[PDB]
Amino acid sequence: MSPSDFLDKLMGRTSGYDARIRPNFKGPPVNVSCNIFINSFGSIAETTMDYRVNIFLRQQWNDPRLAYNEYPDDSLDLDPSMLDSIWKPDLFFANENKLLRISRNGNVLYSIRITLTLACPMDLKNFPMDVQTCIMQLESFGYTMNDLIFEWQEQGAVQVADGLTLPQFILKEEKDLRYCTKHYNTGKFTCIEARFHLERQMGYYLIQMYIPSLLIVILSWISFWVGLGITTVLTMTTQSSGSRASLPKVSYVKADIWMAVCLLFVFSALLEYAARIGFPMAFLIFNMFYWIIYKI
Amino acid sequence: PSDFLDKLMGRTSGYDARIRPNFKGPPVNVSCNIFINSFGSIAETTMDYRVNIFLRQQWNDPRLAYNEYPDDSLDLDPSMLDSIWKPDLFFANETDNKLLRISRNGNVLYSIRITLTLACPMDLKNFPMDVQTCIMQLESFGYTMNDLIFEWQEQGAVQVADGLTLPQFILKEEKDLRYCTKHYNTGKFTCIEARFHLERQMGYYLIQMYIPSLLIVILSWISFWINMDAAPARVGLGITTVLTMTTQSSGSRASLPKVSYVKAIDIWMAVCLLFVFSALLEYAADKISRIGFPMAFLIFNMFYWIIYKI
Amino acid sequence: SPSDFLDKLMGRTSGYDARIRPNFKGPPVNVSCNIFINSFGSYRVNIFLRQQWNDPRLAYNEYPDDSLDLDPSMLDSIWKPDLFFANEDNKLLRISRNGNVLYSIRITLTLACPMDLKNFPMDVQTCIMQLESFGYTMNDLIFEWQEQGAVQVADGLTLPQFILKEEKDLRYCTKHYNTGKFTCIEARFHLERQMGYYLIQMYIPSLLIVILSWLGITTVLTMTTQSSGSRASAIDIWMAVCLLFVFSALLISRIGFPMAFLIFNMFYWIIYKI
Amino acid sequence: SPSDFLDKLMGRTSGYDARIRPNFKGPPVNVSCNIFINVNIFLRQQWNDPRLAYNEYPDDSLDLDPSMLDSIWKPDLFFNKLLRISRNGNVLYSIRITLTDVQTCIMQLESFGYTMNDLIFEWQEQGAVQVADGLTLPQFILKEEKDLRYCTKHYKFTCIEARFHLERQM
Amino acid sequence: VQLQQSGAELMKPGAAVKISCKATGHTISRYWIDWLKQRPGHGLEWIGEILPGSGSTNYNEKFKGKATFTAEKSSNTAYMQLSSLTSEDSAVYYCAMGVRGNYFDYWGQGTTLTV
Amino acid sequence: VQLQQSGAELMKPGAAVKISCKATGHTISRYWIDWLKQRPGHGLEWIGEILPGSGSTNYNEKFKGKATFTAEKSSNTAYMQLSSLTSEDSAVYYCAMGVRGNYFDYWGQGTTLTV
Amino acid sequence: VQLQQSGAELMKPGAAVKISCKATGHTISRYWIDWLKQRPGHGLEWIGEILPGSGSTNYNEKFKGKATFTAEKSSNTAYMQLSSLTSEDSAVYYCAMGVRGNYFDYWGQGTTLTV
Amino acid sequence: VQLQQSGAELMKPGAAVKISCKATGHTISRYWIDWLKQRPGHGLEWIGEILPGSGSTNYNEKFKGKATFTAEKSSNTAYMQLSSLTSEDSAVYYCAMGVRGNYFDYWGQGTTLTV
Amino acid sequence: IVMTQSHKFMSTSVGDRVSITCKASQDVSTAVAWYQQKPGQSPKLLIYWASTRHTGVPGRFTGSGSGTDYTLTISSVQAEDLSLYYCQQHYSTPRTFGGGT
Amino acid sequence: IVMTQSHKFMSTSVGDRVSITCKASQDVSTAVAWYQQKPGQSPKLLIYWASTRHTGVPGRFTGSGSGTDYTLTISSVQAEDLSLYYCQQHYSTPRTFGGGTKL
Amino acid sequence: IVMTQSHKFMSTSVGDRVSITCKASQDVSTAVAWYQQKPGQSPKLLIYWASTRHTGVPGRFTGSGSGTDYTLTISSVQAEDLSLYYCQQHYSTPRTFGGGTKL
Amino acid sequence: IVMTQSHKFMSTSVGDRVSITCKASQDVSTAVAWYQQKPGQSPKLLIYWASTRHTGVPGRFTGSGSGTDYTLTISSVQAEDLSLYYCQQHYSTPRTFGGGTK
Ligand SMILES: *[C@@H]1O[C@H](CO)[C@@H](O[C@@H]2O[C@H](CO)[C@@H](O[C@@H]3O[C@H](CO[C@H]4O[C@H](CO[C@H]5O[C@H](CO)[C@@H](O)[C@H](O)[C@@H]5O[C@H]5O[C@H](CO)[C@@H](O)[C@H](O)[C@@H]5O)[C@@H](O)[C@H](O)[C@@H]4O)[C@@H](O)[C@H](O)[C@@H]3O)[C@H](O)[C@H]2NC(C)=O)[C@H](O)[C@H]1NC(C)=O
Ligand SMILES: *[C@@H]1O[C@H](CO)[C@@H](O[C@@H]2O[C@H](CO)[C@@H](O[C@@H]3O[C@H](CO)[C@@H](O)[C@H](O[C@H]4O[C@H](CO)[C@@H](O)[C@H](O)[C@@H]4O)[C@@H]3O)[C@H](O)[C@H]2NC(C)=O)[C@H](O)[C@H]1NC(C)=O
Missing domain, CATH: 2.70.170.10 (Neurotransmitter-gated ion-channel ligand-binding domain)
Known part of the structure; x- marks a missing residue:
């Protein structure tokens, strides 16, 4: 058969x-x-x-x-x-x-x-x-x-x-x-x-990144009830360094806006101190307004 | 040949x-x-x-x-x-x-x-x-x-x-x-x-990362025993235990990747800080400050390692 | 025979x-x-x-x-x-x-x-x-x-x-x-x-360090940890003029620092528009 | 000459x-x-x-x-x-x-x-x-x-x- | 590994027959799920196997059009569709899963169909 | 894919004709745009294709010199240009975008020129 | 990209003559500069060129010994040393810098020497 | 690179020889050192050399057993050892360190031995 | 090479066989498309590479062709869709069409 | 493609060795596959590739046969396994089973 | 190397075309360059590799030639080009210039 | 390769050339380095690789040769060295050094 x-x-x-x-x-x-x-x-x-x-x-x-x-x-x-x-x-x-x-x-x-x-x-x-x-x-x-x-x-x-x-x-x-x-x-x-x-x-960088920032949201509010507010914005400065582990240098802004909305409200309490319920509840009327958009 | x-x-x-x-x-x-x-x-x-x-x-x-x-x-x-x-x-x-x-x-x-x-x-x-x-x-x-x-x-x-x-x-x-x-x-x-x-x-990280995260936990046994009559001596070093956490939470980010479920190691990082974040509200308001927290984590420290040793 | x-x-x-x-x-x-x-x-x-x-x-x-x-x-x-x-x-x-x-x-x-x-x-x-x-x-x-x-x-x-x-x-x-x-x-x-990233990530939080100078034992190390993320991988004049801004607050002038920045504000836009 | x-x-x-x-x-x-x-x-x-x-x-x-x-x-x-x-x-x-x-x-x-x-x-x-x-x-x-x-x-x-x-x- | 089928069912001539094959223990698109037809009187016959993740098949030459397949990931079952139910439906249907060869070791309990 | 051309337009003999094939929906700098000349009486005939990002072209041998092309990325169009309009301008100009072959499926509505 | 030389100069027979070709617009250590002997009454012929970065030379078999070169990077020049000046120095010396071919596009104005 | 040889010695017929060539300027375990028996009156011939770091040797067939070597790193010297001294030891020993070929360029001041 | 139809005007009744011939002198490929041009609008594409239908072609329009000369059939011809039919050739540098049928 | 046995009937006796053959339409391979079934329940296998065996099995099986002559041989005939078996070739793409030779 | 320009003093007028011979007998290359030299100036570049024109030269100076004898082909003579010019050898190590030809 | 010379001495004065060649038998083509030893000093080389001289005192070097014939031109002499010359090779296993003259 000749194979x-x-x-x-x-x-x-x-x-x-x-x-x-x-x-x-x-x-x-x-x-x-x-x-x-x-x-x-x-x-x-x-x-x-x-x-x-x-x-x-x-x-x-x-x-x-x-x-x-x-x-x-x-x-x-x-x-x-x-x-x-x-x-x-x-x-x-x-x-x-x-x-x-x-x-x-x-x-x-x-x-x-x-x-x-x-x-x-x-x-x-x-x-x-x-x-x-x-x-x-x-x-x-x-x-x-x-x-x-x-x-x-x-x-x-x-x-x-x-x-x-x-x-x-x-x-x-x-x-x-x-x-x-x-x-x-x-x-x-x-x-x-x-x-x-x-x-x-529903978010692992909720747990990885946002929960350590949300841990500061409670921690930035305990000044309402100088060395505390400057330390918590220094902690937000350290979390901003931790938020750039391998993230690129994107010209537009990222869903970076959550770090910035918590970096904005942490020194606003201390300049108000430089100037108890109304300011931490001003975040919750925006935090509930925040998460409605992202269900698309 | x-x-x-x-x-x-x-x-x-x-x-x-x-x-x-x-x-x-x-x-x-x-x-x-x-x-x-x-x-x-x-x-x-x-x-x-x-x-x-x-x-x-x-x-x-x-x-x-x-x-x-x-x-x-x-x-x-x-x-x-x-x-x-x-x-x-x-x-x-x-x-x-x-x-x-x-x-x-x-x-x-x-x-x-x-x-x-x-x-x-x-x-x-x-x-x-x-x-x-x-x-x-x-x-x-x-x-x-x-x-x-x-x-x-x-x-x-x-x-x-x-x-x-x-x-x-x-x-x-x-x-x-x-x-x-x-x-x-x-x-x-x-x-x-x-x-x-x-x-x-754990022979690597007995010295490196998360056994030194118990250097914060053994410091968490210190930042609550002090009475409430010292502003630069209780939350003067009580602001240190939350920035020292950020120096070693990056240690759980540099040498640790992101996973799907919550980390079994990193679960005792935040719950040790969870106790002191309710005692800062009491400044607006001493025996409980002396005895309470060493009889509050040991009820969970012995309970955790029995389940998760299998 | 093709x-x-x-x-x-x-x-x-x-x-x-x-x-x-x-x-x-x-x-x-x-x-x-x-x-x-x-x-x-x-x-x-x-x-x-x-x-x-x-x-x-x-x-x-x-x-x-x-x-x-x-x-x-x-x-x-x-x-x-x-x-x-x-x-x-x-x-x-x-x-x-x-x-x-x-x-x-x-x-x-x-x-x-x-x-x-x-x-x-x-x-x-x-x-x-x-x-x-x-x-x-x-x-x-x-x-x-x-x-x-x-x-x-x-x-x-x-x-x-x-x-x-x-x-x-x-x-x-x-x-x-x-x-x-x-x-x-x-x-x-x-x-x-x-533009965009280098403004929002690099300039503005370091501009915010100027804002809470508008303290001295932690704003010096606040500029130090900025270099922890800006040296591992026009930006150096901003790391040098704010090296003096953190010391000028450590050393009229209430409005003078946004006037000492007003001579520096357009100083960035005149040179670095080319 | 080739x-x-x-x-x-x-x-x-x-x-x-x-x-x-x-x-x-x-x-x-x-x-x-x-x-x-x-x-x-x-x-x-x-x-x-x-x-x-x-x-x-x-x-x-x-x-x-x-x-x-x-x-x-x-x-x-x-x-x-x-x-x-x-x-x-x-x-x-x-x-x-x-x-x-x-x-x-x-x-x-x-x-x-x-x-x-x-x-x-x-x-x-x-x-x-x-x-x-x-x-x-x-x-x-x-x-x-x-x-x-x-x-x-x-x-x-x-x-x-x-x-x-x-x-x-330098 | 358990190959669970459905119960008994009786159909009219000229209709279609839909049967399932529940596979517990592992995912439904893991191994080949081949279908066999056990008709008495004479010998047996081959139908063709399918991969439940893609849908590729190898039909028998006499059974092209007679035997068509369907798969699904969410229900964790494997389907089977018939057409032109003549008097040769008196058989017992099986869903085999031969893992390490085109021979078959795992089988179902059998589903009774007749016309 | 929709292609929109210009309306009816008339020119003097010996002048130049400028028409625009507006491409809505997709990017102008990717797909080829080939142009056809549909004159009645005789059969249909071909002009030559262009890429709107390089200007490369392959004209017909008997139709060189008469046809020149021009691309513009800001207008998302392609320009047909002529010169020395003789009496053979009785035709309808089309822009045909053959995307998956050098046949033509995606056309324009037609542009009416005559001399 | 231009080439500039020095002014007029005169020497005795058997002496040494130093001329330069200043390169204003580019660096001297990049382009080859060749030198010619424009003698009226006779046909022209090749001398040889140098690179001011390496100093490598390529002479003609007819005129070895007479032509010697000297490079310098501090003033961006390319010198031309001479020796044993005979009665054939009645010529104009040009610096010919050819970059994209062995033909010479970038010329100098020349310098009048005679013996 | 300089060589410094040792002093003279008066041995017995059948005794041993031990001399040193101090090398100041370079390591002893780097360059090959050859020893030549410079006997006056007769001709000269190859003995054998060693590297003082690896101990690799190349002897002559007629000179096996007579020539033995000894290396030391911490003294920057090369030790030549002999045995069964005959009445032809009247020769000046030289640490011939030919660095860049089979010839020899570096030499010592002279090591006068006689028995 | 040019693509020319054999007959200029062929017509039959509703739903009959037709033999559209597209004459070529040699056999180079099967790379031939087909078109219809209704009076007043643009020519649209029907078949590409003489075998595969375009997305939107309703069924019975079936192309074919092999050898030096080409042929096809349209089985169910509608009474409202009789117009000019053109050839196409994209296997060489003259991309010529047909005369029309 | 077919997988044809020898006859339509065999004989049985308790405590002996059998020798049944099964052939194909051509000389395909040595892909012998006998299937372990019983009247009433679902089939299983006993022998695959003429020598190897599935786990959870009565170990009285001696598979043999190669080429054009296949041979399935019981060591000792039990009384609890009186049932017919199905020969398969599994090298070509038609997976034809056996016909039946009632013991 | 056989190389000469056999013509020196040729006739000219305003608006003519002339055939030039930079004469060679063997093969060298299709690589010459015609350098036009005004008396008391530098020879400038007008053509290179016998067909490609440099930037700054009008369309009159069109080089031609193939093989041995190469030819610069001007079309219209104005009052700004009645001067001396030279040819050039490229494919040899003695890169020597031509003899000479004046308008 | 045996390497020796029959003639031993030549009488001359300062300003005259001396050159005595030798005859080898095998291929030592450019592996010749004629040496020079003096009483009270070390054996030095006058040439190596048959064409060049070590830097520091280049001086007196002139030499050539091919195959089995080797010359070394000593043209404008002076009165430092007076001894007995030789011919040698150092490529193969027999390596002799010889001496030297003028
Ligand atoms: C690179 O490699 C290629 C491959 O071998 C070679 O290039 C190609 O070489 C062949 C052989 O020479 C050329 O074919 C020729 O084409 C001729 C075209 O003839 C027409 O153009 C002539 C001059 O062009 C002027 O006129 C036209 C139309 O009137 C206008 O474009 C324009 O007015 C031209 O003048 C303009 O010239 C320059 C450049 O645009 C501008 O700067 C000026 O300001 C001025 O406006 C003209 O005389 C003639 O009457 C025609 O009108 C043809 O005659 C001839 O017989 C031959 O077939 C290729 O063209 C050439 N290029 C390509 C791309 O194939 C060569 O080896 C090398 N090329 C180069 C450039 O180095
Ligand atoms: C180019 O690629 C194709 C792969 O797509 C390749 O194979 C051809 O595939 C098509 C379908 O993909 C085949 O067409 C079928 O052929 C059978 C037998 O002739 C017909 O009966 C089929 O019609 C039935 O099926 C349709 C659904 O598929 C039903 O909708 C329809 O109503 C009918 O019931 C169908 O036409 C085709 O046979 C093959 N082969 C060829 C030669 O076309 C094709 O070979 C490749 N071409 C090359 C390489 O030149």
């Missing part, structure tokens, strides 16, 4: 195979059908815009001359040590360990692990309504529309790992799978993207 | 290295195991660590049959490391050192040296004295169950070398060697989980 | 040799190039390059179209312009009918910036990419440009700490080494650092 | 082994090298090589490609690489190399295969150290004089060391 001549019949020495040419030359553009699977969550970098994760990038396409009419098995897989003489599409990410299936009709499946900390352009208006979103784009570089088309598979090709937990955030199930297609001077390319929505629970 | 080896391997027999041997065969099992060179570099902020592994794996290749020489210990030359069949090992939380001991039937014992950089997802149960599962997965990707399956060895699968020291942990001899299996849309793949019964001890 | 018509240039037919340059015994060619950026932050820039030249040994009359894309595995036997950044595989191939090659380089190099660091809130942070030559003197290649549209910026790339201004200075930087004469091109990127 | 004779003395015959030293069983070949700083540097060697001489080509200072050197002799100097050839064979040769109070950050330039008495290393006689045009640094630059000797490590090995004399501002 070593089976590899020679389609590639190798005979049959004239070459990975330097597009399959079905002078013909239709070979579309692929991708599917992704995230593996390891970690290190939300609000300083360097990063997002560390490795993903299985499996893709299904069609190859005309990679068929066979000798062996009865349909879906036979191969070792990764053959891809140096096997056609592969040009994959990289614009926001920047294999297997080889050879089917009977010509379908080829190819999955690698992209080891890449993904760059993430996010907005940080106000995190209980500004949902964190990281965008990864699978746009090619070597071929235009007439040779290579990218698209997502309609059956739910994107999914989250099962036992994946995540710190400081929660990860949702539904997501958008629209197009982001490019236009360059070489031509126009095939971009496809997904949006990983990230919101929180 | 090479006069009769390569001529009987590739020329006259044709060992096709780019396919698996024993065509139309069962899935060729292994008996994979580890051997520790050194642990270390266990980080807690980025929750990663580094472990050095002496791999060695077995199989039964029928193209490793000899009839000329009577010897058994046959570690070959390291130039032929890519001319053999290698199982598709990848790691889920990711002179050649290749000593291969072949047999007559084909029992090859091929060794690999890997210094891996694993990860440990920490779920807080009681972090001073927990048993923390740090996973270690032998994973396969190119082959399904029909072509390749991994196993441990029967006697002594996980072992540590001759009494090497361990930075701020000791590992229990009992471990877990369950047989998981991963599932993907081209077939199910090989999962070999080694759950580490891994503890850690 | 499969054995692709090795007509390279391999057993017509003898193309990539280790010899074509159009030899002749003038230097014009390797006209163009760049493309998509995301820069943290100095880290991702750059896509485009190129254009010609040679008589890459012409054909078999296929009618000019846009003929090879895969990125054909760069092993083409002539490459010997590029590297003087302050430092996704490669599209293209062969036109007359012989024009739209060759490309994807850049993951990390650029560095000899910038003016004095007025860091209000400086034109001009940064340079030297796309200059390595392996030839001025007898084989000349670096020129597309005369219009030599720099393209993505639309959604609006990152904080600054903005990227629209006008960019582009001129020559022509090098002279002991090997010979090297061609050099550059692109001054006029980055203007924005 | 360019097919580039692999005539190279290539198939004429005994050009890319590993053996020039002036075989004979005199040492000294490199009069010199550097250029921008620590990223750009060193260039130059030496005499009568083995790469020619007479049928009229020009003396020609230039070859940076990919010509997989079959070209190198010095074995251990711790983007071009070459040109003169008429007699004065091969100028560079590699793009980076190197990661008044102090000297010392450098050590040695041979690998053989000892000193067939491969001697030197400096050049004029302007062996070179500085950039408009180099500004964070108040830490180097002064104009850079004294030059050997260090002569033994394991006898050559050495090319430079005292980078510097200053320190």
